[PDB]
Design a protein around this nucleic acid. Structure first.
Ligand SMILES: [Mg+2]
Ligand SMILES: [Mg+2]
Ligand SMILES: [Mg+2]
Ligand SMILES: [Mg+2]
Ligand SMILES: [Mg+2]
Ligand SMILES: [Mg+2]
Ligand SMILES: [Mg+2]
Ligand SMILES: [Mg+2]
Ligand SMILES: [Mg+2]
Ligand SMILES: [Mg+2]
Ligand SMILES: [Mg+2]
Ligand SMILES: [Mg+2]
Ligand SMILES: [Mg+2]
Ligand SMILES: [Mg+2]
Ligand SMILES: [Mg+2]
Ligand SMILES: [Mg+2]
Ligand SMILES: [Mg+2]
Ligand SMILES: [Mg+2]
Ligand SMILES: [Mg+2]
Ligand SMILES: [Mg+2]
Ligand SMILES: [Mg+2]
Ligand SMILES: [Mg+2]
Ligand SMILES: [Mg+2]
Ligand SMILES: [Mg+2]
Ligand SMILES: [Mg+2]
Ligand SMILES: [Mg+2]
Ligand SMILES: [Mg+2]
Ligand SMILES: [Mg+2]
Ligand SMILES: [Mg+2]
Ligand SMILES: [Mg+2]
Ligand SMILES: [Mg+2]
Ligand SMILES: [Mg+2]
Ligand SMILES: [Mg+2]
Ligand SMILES: [Mg+2]
Ligand SMILES: [Mg+2]
Ligand SMILES: [Mg+2]
Ligand SMILES: [Mg+2]
Ligand SMILES: [Mg+2]
Ligand SMILES: [Mg+2]
Ligand SMILES: [Mg+2]
Ligand SMILES: [Mg+2]
Ligand SMILES: [Mg+2]
Ligand SMILES: [Mg+2]
Ligand SMILES: [Mg+2]
Ligand SMILES: [Mg+2]
Ligand SMILES: [Mg+2]
Ligand SMILES: [Mg+2]
Ligand SMILES: [Mg+2]
Ligand SMILES: [Mg+2]
Ligand SMILES: [Mg+2]
Ligand SMILES: [Mg+2]
Ligand SMILES: [Mg+2]
Ligand SMILES: [Mg+2]
Ligand SMILES: [Mg+2]
Ligand SMILES: [Mg+2]
Ligand SMILES: [Mg+2]
Ligand SMILES: [Mg+2]
Ligand SMILES: [Mg+2]
Ligand SMILES: [Mg+2]
Ligand SMILES: [Mg+2]
Ligand SMILES: [Mg+2]
Ligand SMILES: [Mg+2]
Ligand SMILES: [Mg+2]
Ligand SMILES: [Mg+2]
Ligand SMILES: [Mg+2]
Ligand SMILES: [Mg+2]
Ligand SMILES: [Mg+2]
Ligand SMILES: [Mg+2]
Ligand SMILES: [Mg+2]
Ligand SMILES: [Mg+2]
Ligand SMILES: [Mg+2]
Ligand SMILES: [Mg+2]
Ligand SMILES: [Mg+2]
Ligand SMILES: [Mg+2]
Ligand SMILES: [Mg+2]
Ligand SMILES: [Mg+2]
Lengths: 52, 81, 64, 96
RNA sequence: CCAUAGGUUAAUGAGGCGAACCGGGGGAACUGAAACAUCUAAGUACCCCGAGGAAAAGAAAUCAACCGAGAUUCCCCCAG
RNA sequence: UUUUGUAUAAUGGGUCAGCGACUUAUAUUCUGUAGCAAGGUUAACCGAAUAGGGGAGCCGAAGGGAAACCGAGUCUUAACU
RNA sequence: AGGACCGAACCGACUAAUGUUGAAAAAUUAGCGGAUGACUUGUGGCUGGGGGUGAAAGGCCAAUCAAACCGGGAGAUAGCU
RNA sequence: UGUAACGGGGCUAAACCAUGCACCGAAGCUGCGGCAGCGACGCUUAUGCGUUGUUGGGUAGGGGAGCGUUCUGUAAGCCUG
RNA sequence: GUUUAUUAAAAACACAGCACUGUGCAAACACGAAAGUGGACGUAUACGGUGUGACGCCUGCCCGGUGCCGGAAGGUUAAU
RNA sequence: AAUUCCUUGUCGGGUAAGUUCCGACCUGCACGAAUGGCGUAAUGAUGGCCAGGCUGUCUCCACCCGAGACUCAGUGAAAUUGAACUCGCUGUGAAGAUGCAGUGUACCCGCGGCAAGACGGAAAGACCCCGUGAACCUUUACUAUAGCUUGACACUGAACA
RNA sequence: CUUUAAUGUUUGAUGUUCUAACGUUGACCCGUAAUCCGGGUUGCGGACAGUGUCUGGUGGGUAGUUUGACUGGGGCGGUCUCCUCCUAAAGAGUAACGGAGGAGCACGAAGGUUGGCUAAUCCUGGUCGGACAUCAGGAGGUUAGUGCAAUGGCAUAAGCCAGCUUGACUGCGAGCGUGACGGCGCGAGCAGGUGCGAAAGCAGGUCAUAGUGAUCCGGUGGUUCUGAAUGGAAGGGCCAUC
């Protein structure tokens, strides 16, 4: 179970987040995806943050 | 003279596959017809194929089993009703 | 003496109009990143208590 | 709730919600209860004198249930839309 | 050394018993939890001290909610 | 009596007579029955008193929602075909 | 002189038989060990229950001991008969 | 342990095969009589009365209807030297 | 010599002796909420505990583990 | 070997013959030095073996003496017990029959004896399993704790360095 | 400001001595006719010791308890959840300490879409080069491949290359399947916003079926929903998540 879990924080200022996993050994670079934000009702770039 | 064992005790649960509605059997839209692993059957008219190759009715009507194609594959279609 | 209410079932169940009981679904408290959003979306709304387990609830909740 | 040693239903299932203290001091009023007061005015102290809502109650709504056949002044209470139409049709005067 | 401790006389009172109720000082475990240790049983049983015909408490550094109530004790609700 | 199953060589009883085991209290639900009926009913207590009074209250006639709140609708949702 | 020797009282209890609803809830008969010693016995006293005492067998503590007896919690609990 | 591998006697059919007509044989079926349950239908129900079918083994267990005992009212009544 | 009164008297216990170890006296230790008492009206040639068990010849190697004793430089570490 | 499984180890002695005994060997399953090693005079109601004497222990029992047993008179129990008009055999069958089936045998009732059966009597099997039973005991099981010990504060102060 | 001294107090640390607390199971006197005790003188010790509260360690010395089930008897051994095949008797389902195998993940591309492509093996020829690298042709026709076990599928490929991308979307969900239940599964379509494609269309993770853990308790972010006189707040609730 080396594939740790992270969260994809909205860059729209909202604290909305998707949660997911990654292999931080083989993918050291940060994950950035363009996902739907249901508060703003737009597709906004999300960035990787810690699952906390 | 005590001894032995059995490395072969396991089995899984029965998944209850098969054909839920047979031919000439009136169904509602969305009704599961067949649950199956592969495409042992194939989706014909007014019949959708699920994520797990489950055949469901997209409309209302009677189930029609039929063999089509050059490979003699078994298709399921919904007749109007 | 009075019957005493099972206070956990009083914190877990609510009586509806025709006498049925609503309850929260399970499986929506943790371990949530591996579950599909469809599953969670069908677990947020309250569900009715089934006919089989409705007797144990009424036995635990005598005062409605 | 004992199911054998199986985990019973009231512990398989999660707790939810909280209890509002304001709901214990709120009440709902039929339109049929409006005639049971005297003076043709409806307050909290009038309904409590008529033994309808109870003493500790501080808030009350009037709901379209039953029917009224007399003009009644409603004062200091919330009224639903259908009860507002039935009161104003029977001659009432909803105020604050 | 004074003094004090101590000694002796005299007067008054107490002591002991007793069914329950009462106030207080200590204070279990079996059991139940389908085990068990937190918990329960239960401040129960038991022991001890003291009192009265009853005792205890008692005249707000109390509640309430911006309206107000007006010592203590007891019963029915509130409310399982 | 217990048992898949006892003439069982499975249990119990020497016999007679007497005693000997699903109760009681309070809550709750259902059925029946009786009274009143969108209302029904009082407890404490008073009372010379199984009366009458007493309607503190309880249940019901409205629900939904975690809740505020809305109300024959309400919740979910930006909004529901 | 002797925790010396043989051997009665006295103390003990190795073997056999009897007896085993006994004469006796541990004894009798025939033999047996010690018998001036770490002996034995009388009277009175002290140690109290998770405690005593024990040349130590879990032995003894009123015919009861891997925790006495009596009363109480107590109608403990018993998914067992 | 005693014939002891037709149930026995016994059987050369009183065995076997085939066919046929008889008969015996159950608490089965039928007959006669009687009780009760549940349904029909009709009456004109007195809320049960004809006819009518059919049903009636039964543990655990569920439902329905009763007998008898002691005591209280009826009862300062009735029975009883 | 002792022992399972009531199925075991023995090779079991004890024993004289030996060794280790504690104890400086208000001794250690033990019984006691405590006061106190025993040890002991004794004082290291004494007392307690443990093991062995007359006498004769002897008692060899291992301190890694677990204990105990001694150390106090460093690390860690409580209430405060 | 109070220790040795293999083992009645092998050899020797003793005996007509010795899985025991004694003495050796050592291949010590799995002795061993104060939970002492090896010897050891004396002692032991101690364990094993051998011999002499002795004898009813036995070959193989016989007779006798007494106390019962047996009979009479008197008193007078007990355990046990569903009811009994309470046979054998073969079979059957909760799988080992007085009671069933088939068959055989048997006049009714005592007394003295024996003990093969009544799965005989006595004691709700002590063995075994089970119980979310109990008790006691153990320990580097868990959680506590007496006790011992450490330090802080208090009782607790004054000076000097 | 930097760097330390002076004087003094606020004061801690270790000694140094003292006496007045405290101790005395040292002597003497009195109560006293008394080896207790108390008082007094004196000597020694001396703020030590010793007690109380708090605290760390040790602590079977003592106490309360736990120490699983299946089991061709119990123990020992093995097993306990999930997936695949057979047993399983041509719908589903179906047991044994029956026969055989796997899982407790992976992937930010190994997902989506558009476009295109089609294997294994063998034969011949051919530099190093060899049974077997790469190259060309031919037979063959999926005997291959599928991230991993088995089964069922797969050419319209679900297999293999490249481009652009994030639908590995949020709210819902008619209707069915499956379970005693908790729960698990499939799902067209709707609203919003998005990607690829000219477009029709496809996309709510992967060819499917294993890759998992209830509740409680607690943590983090968001949200006035609540907020015990009132305004806030704490705390709670709801949503996401650990
Ligand atoms: Mg949550
Ligand atoms: Mg469990
Ligand atoms: Mg307890
Ligand atoms: Mg207990
Ligand atoms: Mg319990
Ligand atoms: Mg008074
Ligand atoms: Mg005022
Ligand atoms: Mg019986
Ligand atoms: Mg049986
Ligand atoms: Mg039965
Ligand atoms: Mg049986
Ligand atoms: Mg029979
Ligand atoms: Mg018999
Ligand atoms: Mg019998
Ligand atoms: Mg039995
Ligand atoms: Mg009997
Ligand atoms: Mg009787
Ligand atoms: Mg009732
Ligand atoms: Mg009624
Ligand atoms: Mg609606
Ligand atoms: Mg002598
Ligand atoms: Mg003698
Ligand atoms: Mg002698
Ligand atoms: Mg023993
Ligand atoms: Mg005794
Ligand atoms: Mg005791
Ligand atoms: Mg005990
Ligand atoms: Mg009790
Ligand atoms: Mg009892
Ligand atoms: Mg013929
Ligand atoms: Mg007949
Ligand atoms: Mg008949
Ligand atoms: Mg008839
Ligand atoms: Mg019949
Ligand atoms: Mg019947
Ligand atoms: Mg019955
Ligand atoms: Mg009468
Ligand atoms: Mg001796
Ligand atoms: Mg003796
Ligand atoms: Mg004895
Ligand atoms: Mg003896
Ligand atoms: Mg002393
Ligand atoms: Mg020894
Ligand atoms: Mg040594
Ligand atoms: Mg060491
Ligand atoms: Mg040390
Ligand atoms: Mg430290
Ligand atoms: Mg050995
Ligand atoms: Mg041997
Ligand atoms: Mg020999
Ligand atoms: Mg011999
Ligand atoms: Mg020898
Ligand atoms: Mg040894
Ligand atoms: Mg040694
Ligand atoms: Mg020795
Ligand atoms: Mg006689
Ligand atoms: Mg008798
Ligand atoms: Mg027989
Ligand atoms: Mg006879
Ligand atoms: Mg016999
Ligand atoms: Mg005899
Ligand atoms: Mg017997
Ligand atoms: Mg028994
Ligand atoms: Mg213990
Ligand atoms: Mg078991
Ligand atoms: Mg075994
Ligand atoms: Mg099948
Ligand atoms: Mg089938
Ligand atoms: Mg793929
Ligand atoms: Mg294509
Ligand atoms: Mg080549
Ligand atoms: Mg793919
Ligand atoms: Mg796959
Ligand atoms: Mg819990
Ligand atoms: Mg607010
Ligand atoms: Mg506030």
């Amino acid at each position: 179970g080396i594939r740790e879990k992270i969260k994809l924080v909205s860059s729209a200022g909202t604290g909305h987040f998707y949660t997911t996993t990654k292999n931080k050994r083989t993918k050291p670079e940060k994950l950035e995806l363009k996902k739907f934000d249901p508060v703003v009702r737009q597709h906004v770039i999300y960035k990787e943050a810690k699952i906390k | 003279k005590a001894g032995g064992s059995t490395r072969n005790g396991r089995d899984s649960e029965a998944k209850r596959l098969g054909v839920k509605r047979f031919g000439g059997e009136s169904v509602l839209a969305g009704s599961i017809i067949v649950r199956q692993r592969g495409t042992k059957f194939h989706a014909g008219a007014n019949v959708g194929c699920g994520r797990d190759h489950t055949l469901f009715a997209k409309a209302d009507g009677k189930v029609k089993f039929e063999v089509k194609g050059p490979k003699n594959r078994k298709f399921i279609s919904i007749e109007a009703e | 003496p009075k019957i005493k209410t099972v206070r956990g079932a009083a914190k877990r169940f609510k009586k509806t109009g025709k006498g049925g009981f609503k309850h929260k679904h399970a499986n929506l408290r943790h371990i949530l990143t591996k579950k599909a959003t469809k599953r969670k979306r069908h677990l947020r709304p309250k569900a009715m208590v089934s006919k089989g387990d409705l007797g144990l609830v009424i036995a635990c909740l005598p005062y409605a | 709730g004992f199911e054998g040693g199986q985990m019973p239903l009231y512990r398989r299932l999660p707790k939810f919600g909280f209890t509002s203290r304001k709901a214990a001091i709120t009440a709902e009023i039929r339109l049929s209860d409006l005639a049971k007061v005297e003076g043709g005015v409806v307050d909290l102290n009038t309904l409590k004198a008529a033994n309808i809502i109870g003493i500790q109650i501080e808030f009350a709504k009037v709901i379209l249930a039953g029917e009224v056949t007399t003009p009644v002044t409603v004062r200091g209470l919330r009224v639903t839309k259908g009860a507002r139409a039935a009161i104003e049709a029977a001659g009432g005067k909803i105020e604050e």
